[PDB]
Design a protein around this nucleic acid. Structure first.
Ligand SMILES: [Mg+2]
Length: 99
RNA sequence: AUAUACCGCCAUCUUAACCCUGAUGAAGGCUACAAAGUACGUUAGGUCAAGGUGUAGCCC
């Protein structure tokens, strides 16, 4: 339901995403990502689509950022201190290619 | 004579934290082609034959 305002219409029972809204949303998201990278924030890409795990890991390694395409264990973010150490720094921005 | 004196030795019997979910209820938390989970006494016991310490008996 919450995706309805972003849908241009249905073409033979297939939803079509309004690309005019996608352009503005992508502009805002890319501006935010660029500003965060300028401030040397830790950027973590996340995606459980196994068809693109290799590509996303390669991209994250290429841009000097971090990736998590594997099984997400309980408490990686909400219990990070116990799972990594008391002085671990969490990501400043998380990018979901697949939500 | 006494282990029905003790030991020695045999045998009997009794005997942590953290993180999520449920509207922050009792409560719950797993799937790998992965979906919240990680950190001693007891006995009128035997044995003084390969071991000891005492205790009492008798002494016309
Ligand atoms: Mg006896």
């Amino acid at each position: 339901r919450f995706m309805e305002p972003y849908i241009f219409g249905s073409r033979l029972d297939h939803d079509i995403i309004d690309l005019e809204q996608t352009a503005t949303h992508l502009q805002l998201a890319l501006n935010f990502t660029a500003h965060m990278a300028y401030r040397k924030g830790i950027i973590l890409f996340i995606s459980r689509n196994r068809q693109f795990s290799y590509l996303i890991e390669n991209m994250a390694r290429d841009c000097g950022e971090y990736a998590h395409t594997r099984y997400f264990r309980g408490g990686m973010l909400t219990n990070a201190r116990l799972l990594f150490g008391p002085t671990v720094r969490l990501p400043d921005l998380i990018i979901f290619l697949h939500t």
